[PDB]
Design an enzyme around this catalytic site. Sequence first.
Site, PDB file in Angstrom:
ATOM      1  N   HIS A  77       0.831  -1.205   0.000  1.00 24.16           N
ATOM      2  CA  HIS A  77       0.000   0.000   0.000  1.00 24.16           C
ATOM      3  C   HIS A  77       0.870   1.261   0.000  1.00 24.16           C
ATOM      4  CE1 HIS A  77      -3.340  -2.750   1.289  1.00 24.16           C
ATOM      5  NE2 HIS A  77      -4.010  -1.928   0.502  1.00 24.16           N
ATOM      6  N   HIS A  96       1.737   1.606  -5.667  1.00 21.93           N
ATOM      7  CA  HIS A  96       0.347   1.185  -5.793  1.00 21.93           C
ATOM      8  C   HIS A  96      -0.568   2.352  -6.143  1.00 21.93           C
ATOM      9  CE1 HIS A  96      -3.506  -0.727  -4.774  1.00 21.93           C
ATOM     10  NE2 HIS A  96      -3.746   0.341  -4.036  1.00 21.93           N
ATOM     11  N   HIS A 133      -5.782   7.669  -2.814  1.00 22.27           N
ATOM     12  CA  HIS A 133      -6.772   6.795  -2.191  1.00 22.27           C
ATOM     13  C   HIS A 133      -6.209   5.963  -1.043  1.00 22.27           C
ATOM     14  CE1 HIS A 133      -4.900   3.552  -4.508  1.00 22.27           C
ATOM     15  NE2 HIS A 133      -5.593   2.710  -3.762  1.00 22.27           N
ATOM     16  N   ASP A 134      -4.890   5.823  -0.943  1.00 25.29           N
ATOM     17  CA  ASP A 134      -4.258   5.030   0.107  1.00 25.29           C
ATOM     18  C   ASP A 134      -3.225   5.851   0.870  1.00 25.29           C
ATOM     19  OD1 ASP A 134      -5.512   2.573   0.318  1.00 25.29           O
ATOM     20  OD2 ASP A 134      -4.357   1.670  -1.314  1.00 25.29           O
ATOM     21  N   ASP A 187      -8.384  -0.353  -8.074  1.00 26.84           N
ATOM     22  CA  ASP A 187      -7.705  -0.737  -6.841  1.00 26.84           C
ATOM     23  C   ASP A 187      -7.144  -2.150  -6.934  1.00 26.84           C
ATOM     24  OD1 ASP A 187      -6.709  -0.407  -4.321  1.00 26.84           O
ATOM     25  OD2 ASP A 187      -8.628  -0.663  -3.281  1.00 26.84           O
ATOM     26  N   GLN A 201      -5.997 -17.284  -4.018  1.00 22.51           N
ATOM     27  CA  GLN A 201      -6.175 -16.357  -5.128  1.00 22.51           C
ATOM     28  C   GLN A 201      -7.355 -16.770  -5.997  1.00 22.51           C
ATOM     29  OE1 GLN A 201      -4.223 -13.318  -5.871  1.00 22.51           O
ATOM     30  NE2 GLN A 201      -4.197 -13.783  -3.676  1.00 22.51           N
TER      31      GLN A 201
HETATM   32  C1  LIG Z   1      -9.062  -4.462  -0.996  1.00 18.34           C
HETATM   33  C2  LIG Z   1      -8.299  -5.752  -0.944  1.00 18.34           C
HETATM   34  C3  LIG Z   1      -7.457  -6.136  -1.982  1.00 18.34           C
HETATM   35  C4  LIG Z   1      -6.755  -7.333  -1.889  1.00 18.34           C
HETATM   36  C5  LIG Z   1      -5.828  -7.725  -2.973  1.00 18.34           C
HETATM   37  C6  LIG Z   1      -5.312  -6.925  -3.970  1.00 18.34           C
HETATM   38  C7  LIG Z   1      -4.469  -7.756  -4.722  1.00 18.34           C
HETATM   39  C8  LIG Z   1      -3.624  -7.401  -5.902  1.00 18.34           C
HETATM   40  F1  LIG Z   1      -2.449  -6.903  -5.542  1.00 18.34           F
HETATM   41  F2  LIG Z   1      -3.369  -8.451  -6.672  1.00 18.34           F
HETATM   42  F3  LIG Z   1      -4.198  -6.492  -6.674  1.00 18.34           F
HETATM   43  N1  LIG Z   1      -4.440  -8.998  -4.256  1.00 18.34           N
HETATM   44  N2  LIG Z   1      -5.286  -8.970  -3.168  1.00 18.34           N
HETATM   45  C9  LIG Z   1      -5.438 -10.166  -2.403  1.00 18.34           C
HETATM   46  C10 LIG Z   1      -4.513 -10.481  -1.418  1.00 18.34           C
HETATM   47  C11 LIG Z   1      -4.667 -11.624  -0.653  1.00 18.34           C
HETATM   48  C12 LIG Z   1      -5.752 -12.459  -0.875  1.00 18.34           C
HETATM   49  O1  LIG Z   1      -5.810 -13.567  -0.071  1.00 18.34           O
HETATM   50  C13 LIG Z   1      -6.792 -14.570  -0.366  1.00 18.34           C
HETATM   51  C14 LIG Z   1      -6.471 -15.775   0.477  1.00 18.34           C
HETATM   52  C15 LIG Z   1      -7.474 -16.514   1.089  1.00 18.34           C
HETATM   53  C16 LIG Z   1      -7.145 -17.589   1.881  1.00 18.34           C
HETATM   54  C17 LIG Z   1      -8.224 -18.417   2.514  1.00 18.34           C
HETATM   55  O2  LIG Z   1      -8.881 -18.008   3.453  1.00 18.34           O
HETATM   56  N3  LIG Z   1      -8.411 -19.636   1.974  1.00 18.34           N
HETATM   57  C18 LIG Z   1      -8.104 -19.992   0.584  1.00 18.34           C
HETATM   58  C19 LIG Z   1      -8.533 -21.430   0.927  1.00 18.34           C
HETATM   59  C20 LIG Z   1      -9.563 -22.173   0.054  1.00 18.34           C
HETATM   60  N4  LIG Z   1      -8.501 -23.152  -0.371  1.00 18.34           N
HETATM   61  C21 LIG Z   1      -7.543 -22.574   0.637  1.00 18.34           C
HETATM   62  C22 LIG Z   1      -8.849 -20.984   2.368  1.00 18.34           C
HETATM   63  C23 LIG Z   1      -5.776 -17.923   2.059  1.00 18.34           C
HETATM   64  C24 LIG Z   1      -5.309 -19.004   2.846  1.00 18.34           C
HETATM   65  C25 LIG Z   1      -3.974 -19.260   2.962  1.00 18.34           C
HETATM   66  C26 LIG Z   1      -3.045 -18.465   2.312  1.00 18.34           C
HETATM   67  C27 LIG Z   1      -3.449 -17.409   1.540  1.00 18.34           C
HETATM   68  C28 LIG Z   1      -4.824 -17.112   1.394  1.00 18.34           C
HETATM   69  N5  LIG Z   1      -5.182 -16.046   0.609  1.00 18.34           N
HETATM   70  C29 LIG Z   1      -6.681 -12.152  -1.858  1.00 18.34           C
HETATM   71  C30 LIG Z   1      -6.522 -11.008  -2.621  1.00 18.34           C
HETATM   72  C31 LIG Z   1      -6.922  -8.112  -0.752  1.00 18.34           C
HETATM   73  C32 LIG Z   1      -7.774  -7.662   0.232  1.00 18.34           C
HETATM   74  N6  LIG Z   1      -8.456  -6.512   0.156  1.00 18.34           N
HETATM   75 MG   LIG Z   2      -7.395   1.919   0.721  1.00 19.38          MG
HETATM   76 ZN   LIG Z   3      -5.848   0.710  -2.558  1.00 18.72          ZN
END
Ligand SMILES: Cc1cc(-c2cc(C(F)(F)F)nn2-c2ccc(OCc3cc(C(=O)N4CC5(CNC5)C4)c4ccccc4n3)cc2)ccn1
Ligand SMILES: [Mg+2]
Ligand SMILES: [Zn+2]
Length: 313
Positions: free
Chosen positions: A69, A73, A107-108, A218, A270
């Site tokens: 952040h 970004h 925004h951040d 975002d 992801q």
């Molecule tokens: C506003 C905002 C933006 C983002 C964001 C932006 C961007 C990018 F930069 F790209 F733009 N990325 N992101 C992002 C980062 C981490 C994320 O994490 C998902 C996850 C879930 C589990 C889990 O709970 N799970 C999955 C499961 C089902 N099978 C296993 C159980 C998880 C568990 C272990 C490890 C890792 C895990 N990650 C998702 C997206 C994130 C949050 N807010």
């Molecule tokens: Mg923000």
């Molecule tokens: Zn942002």
Amino acid sequence: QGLMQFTLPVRLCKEIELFHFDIGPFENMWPGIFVYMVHRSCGTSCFELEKLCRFIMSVKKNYRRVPYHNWKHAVTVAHCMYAILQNNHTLFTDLERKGLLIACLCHDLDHRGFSNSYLQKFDHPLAALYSTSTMEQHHFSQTVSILQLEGHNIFSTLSSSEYEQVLEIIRKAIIATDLALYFGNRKQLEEMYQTGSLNLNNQSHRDRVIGLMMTACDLCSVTKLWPVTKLTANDIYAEFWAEGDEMKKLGIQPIPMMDRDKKDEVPQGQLGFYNAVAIPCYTTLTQILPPTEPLLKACRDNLSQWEKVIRGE
Ligand SMILES: Cc1cc(-c2cc(C(F)(F)F)nn2-c2ccc(OCc3cc(C(=O)N4CC5(CNC5)C4)c4ccccc4n3)cc2)ccn1
Ligand SMILES: [Mg+2]
Ligand SMILES: [Zn+2]
């Protein structure tokens, strides 16, 4: 400021117009790229030149060295907005384009690398301050602050009526980047398109549309080429796990997303995020604004890549 004396290399001008453009390799030019994008969309003589360059470099100062952040970004989010505005030339006003590009850059602002959950749990001055959308209102507040600095008010060479128009537009856009608010905002946008109730003239529908655009820019790192999208994922997890590390030091077990010991389930994480959040957002944006289709396509391309990682294919 050297920012005034900077011009963008000619070989990048067509690449910058692409949705999947990665600013990563050009950190030295990031402040100039925003100037270029402002001058390309809004034009020169839209802002007083020097006040625009103070603003950008001051905006950069108030971004901390957090892993995701950060300043990289902000410009990355601002570029996707510029790409959206350029491919929807006729449907957004002059005051909207300049306001939204400023909003995405700010925004951040002053992000500490912490979730809203963290702050609203470990009694931080920010959570006794803003009870909802904690970091967001602080972002807009830091934006209002920088504008009122001497020689920084890029918008007061404009009315006091046109002034608070662009500032509310900026506030709504920055607040809309709270992901918890996106789910509701999008489900109403989906319904208005089902019944045909979407009105561009209705201003409360404009705010919902812009909020989804704010969500789209975002998360625009999922709309990059696979090598760029993959590396950016490391940055946001390093900032998440660091927040989870600070939770373990207090005896608190973080959710697996914030747990670095559960790295192996990032691929399935992801894929779940793409299907639950990313794909619905860009699909809804594409339906309202068809020219934004490459974002949805690039996101699909990256979902298949996470699919392959899980299966070893
Ligand atoms: C506003 C905002 C933006 C983002 C964001 C932006 C961007 C990018 F930069 F790209 F733009 N990325 N992101 C992002 C980062 C981490 C994320 O994490 C998902 C996850 C879930 C589990 C889990 O709970 N799970 C999955 C499961 C089902 N099978 C296993 C159980 C998880 C568990 C272990 C490890 C890792 C895990 N990650 C998702 C997206 C994130 C949050 N807010
Ligand atoms: Mg923000
Ligand atoms: Zn942002």
